[PDB]
Symmetry: D2
Subunit: 336 residues, 4 copies
């Protein structure tokens, strides 16, 4: 039995000790401590060597990425890529610390656009009428000028031309994940999440990739250069095979919606993830999958019965950099 | 001896409010129980009850607009939208998350589609498949607190305080596999280019059951968009089927052209959005293509403070051009299982005469 | 096992059938149906006669109110008295349908002030600076002109003069509940909750009665007429004795904070309430009592282990009139 | 051939933002782990991380103001406030709900009071008694999902994901009853007029333990207001004791005069409010008596949509005059068990040199 006790600032500001004290502080601070333990378990598993038997089974995929003892799925909503958590995610992907990414369309395009033009701080209360009259789009307390999307249009249209030509003359069958790899290669910029994902052979799934600015541009482009196809069925096979042939899996899911369900549903194909951490502000009472507790996923087989999953009820812009500081960033040497 | 500055601060003088101003007053049960009068009193009760009253007014404005006559060239509209659905004076987009189709709101939505009262549906994969599965086997009441280990050991899946046996999905598999066979055959020998909306139309025709939302949608030529249709049991089944009968392709690009042209060539549009996520964003982004919806009602429990699109207020969408600056959109902060049947009772269900 | 099925509007708009269908609709609609059942159980118990043995024990209080088989505690936060739920609560109190009220200071004073001047509809987004410059106070999407409080001052100060004189020359020992009864008698208006509460011998507890406009006025008054005492200890005995000597109790609690805890803590003195319905929007994850599920109260003994308590996660301005329509209002004849 | 109106709506031109404008950028872990730099980066990360950065700036402004020297007449101030506490250039009110004293935030708050860094405390009954009980017996970690029946059968009470055995309250009873005896004797023969704040000062002196918040508050002459002090275990004990030793009176009127004069005669005030309910409203209402607080930080998880004071944004308090129109208040939407230790680390704990 562990007693409740908070950090005593009479010791001074010892930041590592202060973070470690969240575990015995209670409420969501304790869940944060549990999340640190869960992610550290994923990492310690990932760094354990594969045995001959495990290596054989795990090599049964047609994937370029070297195999590890724990395949980590990282999911995040679009708002987090507009936020500075974009830098946190880029770091993990840059250093091969996660294996599969799932995000929404905005979570793809806003990373690429930040390589062309920045996002700014604003306020939640700013009025839409005056913002619209000035061509400024609001995302929470952030602001994106519409010229950001003008710049995106100029950058993206020549790539769309090439994708259609490769489709029609070289037999390419595009899917969202293949498009995202190509866009990351094109952006060719070390500040971009998707640049590092394609460089490190980390696939990115986004089955509703048309639901944003990328879609806007594909739509306009289709009138002068018709026929681009994005198949979502092949990408479903690809993500499910990453779960089925994993030795162990971990899920780290920031936010709700499709990013959460799609990762969890892939792990149901292996009868459940071994480790799971959720960070989101959704509540269960309306029955939404977004707000469901991890124990709902256990009933489905999306999380194993013997797992000890954790949800932290918090804005990930506060908690996720602290989690990374106490986990992945402490083992950076092992990932290089 | 009371401090003067304190007295000045607490007992500051006021301005008279506009003569327009509406007083707060709740329903008086000394009148007895007239449920119509009770619901009408929500408008002057305050907080989310007042937002409910505003939502009734917004949806009734959508319906009244939709019922105004219009002259328009049938042929050009159909060519520009590649849709057989005739244009009306207000194109209503109805979006809803998967949980609401597991709930009894499935019946509410089915009623609206059955009577051709909305024009476009957007939902997630679960919002498609659980409507079809309910024609094969029921969903049951349970509790939120039921433990996953015991449920999993008994082959029962939890959805909030609802429960679905694994066997429901076995029945779904048996029903769906022959249809997937036909879809692959039609793709490869009859040139069919499948998209989510075209698949959902076919599944509604195949289920052939008037309790199904999607049966009525296809019969009434109401398209259903679901750009991540692979994210659920339908995806599971497409995946398993592809190892027995490879080659099915579902394109999301053509479905993007179809939904966006529904907004672009509308006379007016309204959005009724239950929940958040892709269903909310996809409807609103289509309406950005016409510089914004004319009417909008959101019902959801999401909060803005984490910056999520799901939790954003309607006024965020105004900044983007997804809602017109001149619109008067409404968000009701509530579980739609409570509020949507009441909203329908006071709006669409009152205008049933006009829809026949 | 009960199947999920929603109301079918092909039947037309049969409002009673539509409300009854919430029970099988799921999520919070099902919890609403459960709340209707719980409140109807309280009412059916309340109307059951007392046996000789029960009557003896239950008559052991020094309270004027006739005894019933179920003592119902109704708690509500201040915002609800600013809302039109004030009318709903007034109806229940007018017809002796509940037995004990608990509210905060604002929940007392705003009922009295509405007899002097109305509250108006506004918007949540109205800016505080422009409102303050015009002397308009915001409560959610409601608006109260500051002159409302001017009018309250003129009404209340002569009563405060009399209370101090009765304290100092007639031995009166004031408590919050005794003050609230006196204010209800003074307002002398059938639209007032507290008018009906004192007329029907329904006590009102509010241990932090100084936390609002009443407090403002007592404070200013104390400089010209010092010495008024409001004892909270006697009121603690009074509320606890209502629970201890009840045959059965029910709790109907709208909102959180002191109104919720004070009713629940009184019922712990009898080893728990027999029936309980919570309606509020608070969430459990921060550990707050306001957001705790009913099952937390079971661990304390505030709700009996054999009870079937219900929480509806919703704004009570939507749900509480519907609940009353399906419960108390259907048995109005029995309460007259 | 892309529709022109669509192109015009989606690709609308923009205005240049002020040169002031701050770009979004998160902490770069390629730098390694410098926790101070990591916390500083919250300001430019967005959403509630940005609000945390703003809260750091607001509390540091309170502290910097408090440390400015001031000449003022000791005697008149003391007569007008009936307080021995010397005036500083910024009077800081710290409010917190009961759950936070059951949590480890008890240690955080105790540190601030121990070093005289705040001037007024407001909490609920639980926020008083659980600090005292922790000097007798500990609180334990548990889980939110633990079932009440099994816990009750084992004599364990749940507070969120924390657990307190019944025996803690038995130890509290044994400790408290002799003190209540002395309080009744002092009331009846020495003219003491008890109020919650005076009782809380006495209990802190009696617990005589440097782990206790209230031990330090009374030693440093920091008053604690709790107008519903009877609403908890202290109330239970006062109730039981009154049948053995009748007559204790706790007056809330004099405590209202004491807290309001703390605000009225302040040079400046700041509010730091953790949670909602009475603690939030009581601090803010006291500050209305001076026409508003100069600085304010709220940390809570409550939402505005139900109209509750707990969930109200700071800008609602501006309409009332509880916060000055010229102030720049901040709300962080978060569990304070996560954010308050980080806030203290970046504010009060950095200025420890000045407070000694």
């Amino acid at each position: 039995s562990t007693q409740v006790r908070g950090y005593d600032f009479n010791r001074g500001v010892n930041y590592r000790a202060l973070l470690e004290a969240f575990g015995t502080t209670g409420f969501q601070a304790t869940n944060f401590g549990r999340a640190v333990q869960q992610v550290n378990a994923m990492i310690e598993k990932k760094l354990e060597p594969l045995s001959q038997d495990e290596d054989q089974h795990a090599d049964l995929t047609q994937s370029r990425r070297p195999l590890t003892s724990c395949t980590i799925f990282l999911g995040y909503t679009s708002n987090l890529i507009s936020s500075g958590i974009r830098e946190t995610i880029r770091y993990l992907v840059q250093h091969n610390m996660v294996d599969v990414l799932v995000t929404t369309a905005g979570g793809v395009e806003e990373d690429l656009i930040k390589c062309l033009a920045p996002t700014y701080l604003g306020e939640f209360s700013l009025r839409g009428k005056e913002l619209r009259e000035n061509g400024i789009n609001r995302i929470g307390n952030l602001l994106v000028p519409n010229e950001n999307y003008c710049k995106f249009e100029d950058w993206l249209m020549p790539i769309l031309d090439q994708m259609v030509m490769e489709q029609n003359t070289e037999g390419v069958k595009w899917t969202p994940s293949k498009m995202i790899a190509r866009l990351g290669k094109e952006i060719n910029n070390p500040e971009s999440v998707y640049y590092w994902a394609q460089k490190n052979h980390i696939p990115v799934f986004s089955p509703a990739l048309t639901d944003g600015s990328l879609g806007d541009m594909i739509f306009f482009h289709s009138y002068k250069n018709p026929g681009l196809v994005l198949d979502i069925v092949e990408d479903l096979r690809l993500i499910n095979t990453q779960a089925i042939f994993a030795k162990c899996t971990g899920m780290i899911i920031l936010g709700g919606g499709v990013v959460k369900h799609h990762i969890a549903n892939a792990n149901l194909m292996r009868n459940g993830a071994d480790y799971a951490v959720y960070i989101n502000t959704a509540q269960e009472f309306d029955g939404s999958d977004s707000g469901a507790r991890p124990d709902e996923a256990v009933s489905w087989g999306k999380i194993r019965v013997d797992a000890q999953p954790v949800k932290v009820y918090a804005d990930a812009s506060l908690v996720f950099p602290l989690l990374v500081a106490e986990t992945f960033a402490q083992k950076m040497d092992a990932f290089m």
